[PDB]
Homo-oligomer: 53 residues x 2
């Protein structure tokens, strides 16, 4: 809820994971490992602006 | 090259931006502003594992 990052599991199902924005990217990705089991490097980082017009 | 994050501009064209993994997520997104001009909150964060099978 605070900052649930959007992620896609190898299988396909969508996955949510809350983490502080200030928290280092490496740390955030590392949690995804615990969440499933995939190296942080593998996770593809993506950004997209969407100003709710 | 070091860690060019994947981003998609409001227009559509793809954008690349290198930033240290350790660097705070908020700081990383903030640069995207300088890169174009969009609030960090607007940028959608995404992660996807892809082990080069």
């Amino acid at each position: 809820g605070s900052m649930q990052i959007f992620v896609k599991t190898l299988t396909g199902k969508t996955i949510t994971l809350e983490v502080e924005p200030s928290d280092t990217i490496e740390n955030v990705k590392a949690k995804i490992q615990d969440k499933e089991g995939i190296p942080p490097d593998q996770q593809r980082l993506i950004f997209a602006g969407k100003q709710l017009e």
